[PDB]
């Protein structure tokens, strides 16, 4: 189960770089130089890295220091063959963003947030990113009077429309992906799930420029089925990018390595990605626990990729098994894929077999045989065929 | 706090009519005749009632019994002046719907579900309903292999498109409202939240015919902020109807009377409905607890309406208070309502005050004054000004 | 992975017997005769069955019908060699129990609940049960004024003390196991978790007669770690019995077959049971989903046992692996098992190496190596060593 | 609603002192000197303050700096008349505690944790505290193999037994209160709820020295009913102290001011505290949101106390209302307080009215009248009688 760059595995700088500060504790690890993380990840088989602005260039850096941090980074990517498929902006750490970036009540902050974003879009394009992520972790509220949500969605629409005007005016080939999260660090965050983000995109001026970057642990923080939300983003043609990690249920955002957390949801997610032929980056947005030293950081990053390749093998064995293909027909998955009424409305209304002479008792008595199918899926996951 | 028919309070037949069967217990109350519930609700001040097909006409009724049940019902509405603003279909109780109605894997069941629905659309129009609700409580799965969600959304799109062809062909003035629920009775339900339902509507052939009917307890079953999801449905122009009740957090769907459950979320919901000028029915979809006799049923239905009118009074006193209007300006709610960059993109890019000379420390130091605003909201809710 | 009676697998009559009535739907399967379930379970390799009173003898049966239902049941156990290690009382289905059994506000109901219980204790002893379970699913409240909890715990203590007087007076060899559940069907249930049940037992007159019967899905309905609650019940010497099933997070009680739900928690539960040498019944309290016919019922019951034996094999391979034993020492699990201060208090106070000369920076820098250990556990679960 | 020192309102130094660092952001406020917080809180009407060791004396302070920080603090308490009823130890911030204090796998760390604790017990006694709190926020695990929970409870028992030997040997009049929390910052924390903490205390060598300090938001992080857990701690005689705050459901620990979050649970908590006559400190363990400046800090601290006094007034009006006392009898709360079988076991067994001639249908038909009672409670909370 050895990853190579063709598996398209990517990592944020801030993931292996997390120093382990939590709401209740100090850092347990020293800061890593981005150049060192590029080298170590390339040795483990990753394909590329991603960054917020402030991960790469320390906030407040002069133009001269900026160019230096970029030059060194670009040297490490040249040295290793690592790519940068995605970049994003930090609009959450600095105190100025305490009430949001794009939906801060202070108009001056909102203008600042857009300027900080556009500066990083130019950088991202220079480094070759194809996707620019937006996670508005400070957009929201702890109390009901602090944020009129209609006005806040007007502000959020306005910011995304201005960014889409900017990229089209520059002729850049970059698309945006909004990443939803239901809470933390705000009491409630706006666009809290993949569905809310999909719906909001349909009101932007140029919807084709925007998709979603859903994260496993975020949807599970609302108790939702992650594979079902990804199937809906795929159905809408909007899965531009994905963030992979693990989460044990509804609590703070744990960001465990991928495969930890809900392991059957991990299996059905890989099953769907590989069967729909998603071809974007498999990006890990995770935190090695603060119990770990540097050795434990690289072990946790390597288990992200390992677990994805094991689940890929298991899901492909499941769908290839003749006995599973038989059970899928026994449960009528083939019939779910056929149109209900390709005959059209009038024909359905005239069909006595659809109502007047439909035997509801006989149809009610047929079992779905779902539990036999699900135990075959369990046996395949566990290697117990 | 006495309701009249002008407050537009409505109730489902199945709400005061719930006999108190739960997953662990037998009915504790006898069945009510719909005619008796119409009379009792009209005496309490309601404006109207709503129904599933099978609440009004017992499943399998002959054409003759059907006409009789409708005639008696119509007599009670004539006698009381009660209206029927909304109707819906039962596609969840009968065993035939064990795997869904519109997304059952069996194609024959899917055709049956559409025929059962269309028959009830004609009835609804005859009784004057303006909104037809769809709650697909059996659309979903307990296991990952039982439902390919992309094929299931194709089926769900197909069913809603056929219904929109039917109403337009008949020239009916009726719109559809999809009601999301994240789980129960299926392990996960498709379109589990208001955002997922809004996004799905944008892929239908005639999106203007469809909106949402969100329910308080359903969004809170995913830990989401109900007033924020309603603000997004209002922002999209899709709040066609609403279901009011109470829920204590993330657990089974309790359907407590409105005002029970999360009382501050109830306050901020009424604040939003009345300030956005929602003019649809205020419909209660609740269950008087099975501890109650008939007296306790009508007391619980009356407290639904009582609590709405108390919260309405408190939220109007809050927004009318000069000291609250001052605190709203102190927290920059006025600035949230102004465009971030009506000056346009180029102007924002040339503005040195938005970046190069923006004093981030001074802006970071300004407090939002949100806690004083929220305590004024608390004092107004409690009548403790 | 074939079960035999020596694996001590047991099933409630109500589990394979569930007809599939849910809060939103009618039964999808016909009722099974207890004699048929005894035979089918014995063919699948189970060791025994359990029962509520009302599963075996229909509520209100005359003394003559009672003796007949028992005689037939006893014939099937003789025919198959099946045992009955546990029995319990239904104090939740009948409308009389709408506010509880032992903590109903009506004193007459509370006396009735005790009489119904004692009648079934005599039956249980006659059939050889060693454990009598109490699940007070109706003990609790939907609203704060309906139940004074101090008075309710006095009532609950009083009922359990009377039952312990009864068994000791009869000289029966039977112990009680209280089964906690946090909600459903009441809004909140008293003694909602294993910890609350352990604490309550310590106030009974004869605590040695009472332990816990925790259920996987119940603790996970509160978001708690099931293996950690079982380790605490084992530490207290009170794991008298256990109920095995699966649950996907915090929502209604799903009762999926064991291994479904949280599969890594299932692995660590089997690891603990087999390493602590629990020797009671491995009892399944699950519901075959209502999508299923009879074939799907027996498939789901068989996958309960299958999944337990696969996890047993995987956890034994994990603890036997020399490389895992090395990683356990690398993470200092051996040091967790040694006393912190067997030297005693004075010695600890005089030890300069514990404070004055303790190098906190060096100890802080040591990694715990937990992620390497957890990936070995993942590889062993998946058969990917 | 003006607090005075006789209301016994207390605050941690770390609460108004929180600088607003969160997992995603930098501090938004400067550090406060403890002397300034003592003065400001005394002006708002508080009765006293509490502290962790490291809040008062910066970690690593020499003996000389230690004595200086204590002298200044003692001057401010003398100047204001503020008391210090409770103190606790920080065993969670420093990197050395990354795997726990009392249950760290490294034995050296466990000995260090006890020495750090005992040094602060002596300080606490010197300042007059009567309760010493233990919150083991780092005791737990992110993965199943990292912590054998039986060995960890042996270690936790050992540490608490050594502390109880120390206080008894010194002749101090100080009792311990364990504060449970279900997760955060560890993936799962040991003794995660009030019930688990009550049960654990019953295995200590001298149980009478130990009680609980439950926190509103902590039990609600497991979806549990806080007033019901406090009624059980009161029933056991173990409510030594309490921490008051607000939380919106199951998510990260928000620590909103008291009255925010679940306001009806706040009402029923004050109802219980004042009706059981709890006479300990009403301590607020909350964080003014990081959106706030210093003005917003003192406003949030003042609303904690305000909300408690409003709820106290409302709950006393509820229990004093003759119409409520009538409804309580209508719902048989008086009967819940009477023994079920003061007549004894034999008498219950011979009583034909408890079984053979008990009319279950008539008892089943009586309504509990709970919804009328709960609407009276709602009207009293809202001031809408
Ligand atoms: O902005 C950060 C990211 O893009 C987001 O993915 C974090 O890593 C949150 O999840
Ligand atoms: O179909 C039923 C309804 O329309 C739904 O609202 C139920 O009452 C569920 O919430
Ligand atoms: O009383 C029923 C049982 O003993 C209980 O285990 C149910 O099956 C609930 O879980
Ligand atoms: O140790 C801290 C406390 O005693 C704890 O109460 C925190 O403030 C956590 O809740
Ligand atoms: Mn995350
Ligand atoms: Mn992410
Ligand atoms: Mn509902
Ligand atoms: Mn509804
Ligand atoms: Mn259960
Ligand atoms: Mn059970
Ligand atoms: Mn807290
Ligand atoms: Mn606390």
mmCIF file with all atom_site columns, C-alpha atoms in Angstrom, chain D residues 51-170:
data_model
loop_
_atom_site.group_PDB
_atom_site.id
_atom_site.type_symbol
_atom_site.label_atom_id
_atom_site.label_alt_id
_atom_site.label_comp_id
_atom_site.label_asym_id
_atom_site.label_entity_id
_atom_site.label_seq_id
_atom_site.pdbx_PDB_ins_code
_atom_site.Cartn_x
_atom_site.Cartn_y
_atom_site.Cartn_z
_atom_site.occupancy
_atom_site.B_iso_or_equiv
_atom_site.pdbx_formal_charge
_atom_site.auth_seq_id
_atom_site.auth_comp_id
_atom_site.auth_asym_id
_atom_site.auth_atom_id
_atom_site.pdbx_PDB_model_num
ATOM 1   C CA . UNK D 1 51  ? -8.070  30.433 40.834 1.00 0.00 ? 51  UNK D CA 1
ATOM 2   C CA . UNK D 1 52  ? -5.879  27.765 39.336 1.00 0.00 ? 52  UNK D CA 1
ATOM 3   C CA . UNK D 1 53  ? -2.322  27.876 40.699 1.00 0.00 ? 53  UNK D CA 1
ATOM 4   C CA . UNK D 1 54  ? -0.956  29.119 37.391 1.00 0.00 ? 54  UNK D CA 1
ATOM 5   C CA . UNK D 1 55  ? -3.590  31.921 37.081 1.00 0.00 ? 55  UNK D CA 1
ATOM 6   C CA . UNK D 1 56  ? -2.224  33.525 40.299 1.00 0.00 ? 56  UNK D CA 1
ATOM 7   C CA . UNK D 1 57  ? 1.492   32.610 40.100 1.00 0.00 ? 57  UNK D CA 1
ATOM 8   C CA . UNK D 1 58  ? 3.050   32.331 36.620 1.00 0.00 ? 58  UNK D CA 1
ATOM 9   C CA . UNK D 1 59  ? 4.407   28.835 36.007 1.00 0.00 ? 59  UNK D CA 1
ATOM 10  C CA . UNK D 1 60  ? 8.054   28.590 36.997 1.00 0.00 ? 60  UNK D CA 1
ATOM 11  C CA . UNK D 1 61  ? 8.024   31.626 39.364 1.00 0.00 ? 61  UNK D CA 1
ATOM 12  C CA . UNK D 1 62  ? 10.735  31.536 42.029 1.00 0.00 ? 62  UNK D CA 1
ATOM 13  C CA . UNK D 1 63  ? 9.782   31.327 45.704 1.00 0.00 ? 63  UNK D CA 1
ATOM 14  C CA . UNK D 1 64  ? 10.363  35.058 45.935 1.00 0.00 ? 64  UNK D CA 1
ATOM 15  C CA . UNK D 1 65  ? 8.116   35.982 43.026 1.00 0.00 ? 65  UNK D CA 1
ATOM 16  C CA . UNK D 1 66  ? 5.507   33.508 44.376 1.00 0.00 ? 66  UNK D CA 1
ATOM 17  C CA . UNK D 1 67  ? 5.339   35.326 47.751 1.00 0.00 ? 67  UNK D CA 1
ATOM 18  C CA . UNK D 1 68  ? 4.975   38.684 46.017 1.00 0.00 ? 68  UNK D CA 1
ATOM 19  C CA . UNK D 1 69  ? 2.110   37.581 43.760 1.00 0.00 ? 69  UNK D CA 1
ATOM 20  C CA . UNK D 1 70  ? 0.321   36.167 46.804 1.00 0.00 ? 70  UNK D CA 1
ATOM 21  C CA . UNK D 1 71  ? 0.920   39.318 48.914 1.00 0.00 ? 71  UNK D CA 1
ATOM 22  C CA . UNK D 1 72  ? -0.561  41.584 46.245 1.00 0.00 ? 72  UNK D CA 1
ATOM 23  C CA . UNK D 1 73  ? -3.552  39.305 45.755 1.00 0.00 ? 73  UNK D CA 1
ATOM 24  C CA . UNK D 1 74  ? -4.197  39.173 49.558 1.00 0.00 ? 74  UNK D CA 1
ATOM 25  C CA . UNK D 1 75  ? -4.062  42.970 49.664 1.00 0.00 ? 75  UNK D CA 1
ATOM 26  C CA . UNK D 1 76  ? -6.815  43.196 47.013 1.00 0.00 ? 76  UNK D CA 1
ATOM 27  C CA . UNK D 1 77  ? -9.028  40.704 48.908 1.00 0.00 ? 77  UNK D CA 1
ATOM 28  C CA . UNK D 1 78  ? -8.468  42.733 52.122 1.00 0.00 ? 78  UNK D CA 1
ATOM 29  C CA . UNK D 1 79  ? -9.311  45.947 50.267 1.00 0.00 ? 79  UNK D CA 1
ATOM 30  C CA . UNK D 1 80  ? -12.577 44.628 48.844 1.00 0.00 ? 80  UNK D CA 1
ATOM 31  C CA . UNK D 1 81  ? -13.846 42.042 51.304 1.00 0.00 ? 81  UNK D CA 1
ATOM 32  C CA . UNK D 1 82  ? -13.775 39.372 48.451 1.00 0.00 ? 82  UNK D CA 1
ATOM 33  C CA . UNK D 1 83  ? -13.395 35.736 49.571 1.00 0.00 ? 83  UNK D CA 1
ATOM 34  C CA . UNK D 1 84  ? -11.761 32.705 47.850 1.00 0.00 ? 84  UNK D CA 1
ATOM 35  C CA . UNK D 1 85  ? -14.093 29.770 48.459 1.00 0.00 ? 85  UNK D CA 1
ATOM 36  C CA . UNK D 1 86  ? -12.523 27.348 45.881 1.00 0.00 ? 86  UNK D CA 1
ATOM 37  C CA . UNK D 1 87  ? -9.177  26.753 44.240 1.00 0.00 ? 87  UNK D CA 1
ATOM 38  C CA . UNK D 1 88  ? -7.902  24.157 41.715 1.00 0.00 ? 88  UNK D CA 1
ATOM 39  C CA . UNK D 1 89  ? -4.693  23.176 39.912 1.00 0.00 ? 89  UNK D CA 1
ATOM 40  C CA . UNK D 1 90  ? -3.755  23.670 36.236 1.00 0.00 ? 90  UNK D CA 1
ATOM 41  C CA . UNK D 1 91  ? -2.824  20.081 35.141 1.00 0.00 ? 91  UNK D CA 1
ATOM 42  C CA . UNK D 1 92  ? -3.742  20.779 31.464 1.00 0.00 ? 92  UNK D CA 1
ATOM 43  C CA . UNK D 1 93  ? -1.852  23.759 29.896 1.00 0.00 ? 93  UNK D CA 1
ATOM 44  C CA . UNK D 1 94  ? 1.853   22.833 30.073 1.00 0.00 ? 94  UNK D CA 1
ATOM 45  C CA . UNK D 1 95  ? 3.100   20.420 27.417 1.00 0.00 ? 95  UNK D CA 1
ATOM 46  C CA . UNK D 1 96  ? 4.225   17.961 30.167 1.00 0.00 ? 96  UNK D CA 1
ATOM 47  C CA . UNK D 1 97  ? 0.502   17.246 30.764 1.00 0.00 ? 97  UNK D CA 1
ATOM 48  C CA . UNK D 1 98  ? -0.181  16.320 27.128 1.00 0.00 ? 98  UNK D CA 1
ATOM 49  C CA . UNK D 1 99  ? -1.239  12.741 28.120 1.00 0.00 ? 99  UNK D CA 1
ATOM 50  C CA . UNK D 1 100 ? -2.745  13.650 31.521 1.00 0.00 ? 100 UNK D CA 1
ATOM 51  C CA . UNK D 1 101 ? -1.635  14.536 35.062 1.00 0.00 ? 101 UNK D CA 1
ATOM 52  C CA . UNK D 1 102 ? -2.860  11.785 37.427 1.00 0.00 ? 102 UNK D CA 1
ATOM 53  C CA . UNK D 1 103 ? -3.299  9.208  34.576 1.00 0.00 ? 103 UNK D CA 1
ATOM 54  C CA . UNK D 1 104 ? -0.387  10.121 32.297 1.00 0.00 ? 104 UNK D CA 1
ATOM 55  C CA . UNK D 1 105 ? 1.248   6.936  31.061 1.00 0.00 ? 105 UNK D CA 1
ATOM 56  C CA . UNK D 1 106 ? 4.689   8.338  32.238 1.00 0.00 ? 106 UNK D CA 1
ATOM 57  C CA . UNK D 1 107 ? 4.939   7.575  36.000 1.00 0.00 ? 107 UNK D CA 1
ATOM 58  C CA . UNK D 1 108 ? 7.316   10.521 36.525 1.00 0.00 ? 108 UNK D CA 1
ATOM 59  C CA . UNK D 1 109 ? 4.637   12.949 35.220 1.00 0.00 ? 109 UNK D CA 1
ATOM 60  C CA . UNK D 1 110 ? 2.022   11.403 37.508 1.00 0.00 ? 110 UNK D CA 1
ATOM 61  C CA . UNK D 1 111 ? 4.299   12.042 40.566 1.00 0.00 ? 111 UNK D CA 1
ATOM 62  C CA . UNK D 1 112 ? 4.939   15.626 39.382 1.00 0.00 ? 112 UNK D CA 1
ATOM 63  C CA . UNK D 1 113 ? 1.169   16.194 38.972 1.00 0.00 ? 113 UNK D CA 1
ATOM 64  C CA . UNK D 1 114 ? 0.577   15.150 42.624 1.00 0.00 ? 114 UNK D CA 1
ATOM 65  C CA . UNK D 1 115 ? 3.403   17.362 43.926 1.00 0.00 ? 115 UNK D CA 1
ATOM 66  C CA . UNK D 1 116 ? 2.050   20.388 41.941 1.00 0.00 ? 116 UNK D CA 1
ATOM 67  C CA . UNK D 1 117 ? -1.442  19.736 43.348 1.00 0.00 ? 117 UNK D CA 1
ATOM 68  C CA . UNK D 1 118 ? -0.320  19.408 47.033 1.00 0.00 ? 118 UNK D CA 1
ATOM 69  C CA . UNK D 1 119 ? 1.638   22.702 46.877 1.00 0.00 ? 119 UNK D CA 1
ATOM 70  C CA . UNK D 1 120 ? -1.549  24.414 45.732 1.00 0.00 ? 120 UNK D CA 1
ATOM 71  C CA . UNK D 1 121 ? -3.736  22.715 48.407 1.00 0.00 ? 121 UNK D CA 1
ATOM 72  C CA . UNK D 1 122 ? -1.538  24.405 51.090 1.00 0.00 ? 122 UNK D CA 1
ATOM 73  C CA . UNK D 1 123 ? -2.025  27.780 49.337 1.00 0.00 ? 123 UNK D CA 1
ATOM 74  C CA . UNK D 1 124 ? -5.733  27.301 49.028 1.00 0.00 ? 124 UNK D CA 1
ATOM 75  C CA . UNK D 1 125 ? -6.121  26.543 52.760 1.00 0.00 ? 125 UNK D CA 1
ATOM 76  C CA . UNK D 1 126 ? -4.015  29.626 53.554 1.00 0.00 ? 126 UNK D CA 1
ATOM 77  C CA . UNK D 1 127 ? -6.455  31.781 51.518 1.00 0.00 ? 127 UNK D CA 1
ATOM 78  C CA . UNK D 1 128 ? -9.490  30.197 53.160 1.00 0.00 ? 128 UNK D CA 1
ATOM 79  C CA . UNK D 1 129 ? -10.869 27.959 50.408 1.00 0.00 ? 129 UNK D CA 1
ATOM 80  C CA . UNK D 1 130 ? -13.278 25.287 51.566 1.00 0.00 ? 130 UNK D CA 1
ATOM 81  C CA . UNK D 1 131 ? -13.451 23.283 48.281 1.00 0.00 ? 131 UNK D CA 1
ATOM 82  C CA . UNK D 1 132 ? -10.605 22.132 46.091 1.00 0.00 ? 132 UNK D CA 1
ATOM 83  C CA . UNK D 1 133 ? -11.754 21.268 42.478 1.00 0.00 ? 133 UNK D CA 1
ATOM 84  C CA . UNK D 1 134 ? -10.138 18.654 40.229 1.00 0.00 ? 134 UNK D CA 1
ATOM 85  C CA . UNK D 1 135 ? -10.941 18.860 36.467 1.00 0.00 ? 135 UNK D CA 1
ATOM 86  C CA . UNK D 1 136 ? -8.785  16.203 34.724 1.00 0.00 ? 136 UNK D CA 1
ATOM 87  C CA . UNK D 1 137 ? -9.167  17.751 31.240 1.00 0.00 ? 137 UNK D CA 1
ATOM 88  C CA . UNK D 1 138 ? -6.087  15.816 29.900 1.00 0.00 ? 138 UNK D CA 1
ATOM 89  C CA . UNK D 1 139 ? -7.099  12.403 31.415 1.00 0.00 ? 139 UNK D CA 1
ATOM 90  C CA . UNK D 1 140 ? -8.324  10.346 28.443 1.00 0.00 ? 140 UNK D CA 1
ATOM 91  C CA . UNK D 1 141 ? -7.357  9.433  24.862 1.00 0.00 ? 141 UNK D CA 1
ATOM 92  C CA . UNK D 1 142 ? -7.851  9.987  21.153 1.00 0.00 ? 142 UNK D CA 1
ATOM 93  C CA . UNK D 1 143 ? -7.366  6.260  20.274 1.00 0.00 ? 143 UNK D CA 1
ATOM 94  C CA . UNK D 1 144 ? -8.321  2.983  21.862 1.00 0.00 ? 144 UNK D CA 1
ATOM 95  C CA . UNK D 1 145 ? -4.833  1.457  22.457 1.00 0.00 ? 145 UNK D CA 1
ATOM 96  C CA . UNK D 1 146 ? -3.234  4.525  24.084 1.00 0.00 ? 146 UNK D CA 1
ATOM 97  C CA . UNK D 1 147 ? -5.044  4.136  27.500 1.00 0.00 ? 147 UNK D CA 1
ATOM 98  C CA . UNK D 1 148 ? -6.035  0.997  29.351 1.00 0.00 ? 148 UNK D CA 1
ATOM 99  C CA . UNK D 1 149 ? -8.992  2.486  31.256 1.00 0.00 ? 149 UNK D CA 1
ATOM 100 C CA . UNK D 1 150 ? -8.913  -0.024 34.182 1.00 0.00 ? 150 UNK D CA 1
ATOM 101 C CA . UNK D 1 151 ? -5.279  0.805  34.824 1.00 0.00 ? 151 UNK D CA 1
ATOM 102 C CA . UNK D 1 152 ? -6.058  4.528  34.389 1.00 0.00 ? 152 UNK D CA 1
ATOM 103 C CA . UNK D 1 153 ? -8.887  4.356  37.074 1.00 0.00 ? 153 UNK D CA 1
ATOM 104 C CA . UNK D 1 154 ? -6.443  2.541  39.371 1.00 0.00 ? 154 UNK D CA 1
ATOM 105 C CA . UNK D 1 155 ? -4.059  5.500  38.856 1.00 0.00 ? 155 UNK D CA 1
ATOM 106 C CA . UNK D 1 156 ? -6.877  8.047  39.341 1.00 0.00 ? 156 UNK D CA 1
ATOM 107 C CA . UNK D 1 157 ? -8.021  6.300  42.565 1.00 0.00 ? 157 UNK D CA 1
ATOM 108 C CA . UNK D 1 158 ? -4.414  6.180  43.788 1.00 0.00 ? 158 UNK D CA 1
ATOM 109 C CA . UNK D 1 159 ? -3.919  9.975  43.216 1.00 0.00 ? 159 UNK D CA 1
ATOM 110 C CA . UNK D 1 160 ? -7.209  10.934 44.949 1.00 0.00 ? 160 UNK D CA 1
ATOM 111 C CA . UNK D 1 161 ? -6.485  8.571  47.893 1.00 0.00 ? 161 UNK D CA 1
ATOM 112 C CA . UNK D 1 162 ? -3.021  10.159 48.359 1.00 0.00 ? 162 UNK D CA 1
ATOM 113 C CA . UNK D 1 163 ? -4.616  13.648 48.348 1.00 0.00 ? 163 UNK D CA 1
ATOM 114 C CA . UNK D 1 164 ? -7.178  12.560 50.995 1.00 0.00 ? 164 UNK D CA 1
ATOM 115 C CA . UNK D 1 165 ? -4.311  11.100 53.083 1.00 0.00 ? 165 UNK D CA 1
ATOM 116 C CA . UNK D 1 166 ? -2.458  14.415 52.799 1.00 0.00 ? 166 UNK D CA 1
ATOM 117 C CA . UNK D 1 167 ? -5.393  16.659 53.887 1.00 0.00 ? 167 UNK D CA 1
ATOM 118 C CA . UNK D 1 168 ? -6.300  14.368 56.809 1.00 0.00 ? 168 UNK D CA 1
ATOM 119 C CA . UNK D 1 169 ? -2.630  14.229 57.911 1.00 0.00 ? 169 UNK D CA 1
ATOM 120 C CA . UNK D 1 170 ? -2.444  18.046 57.825 1.00 0.00 ? 170 UNK D CA 1
#
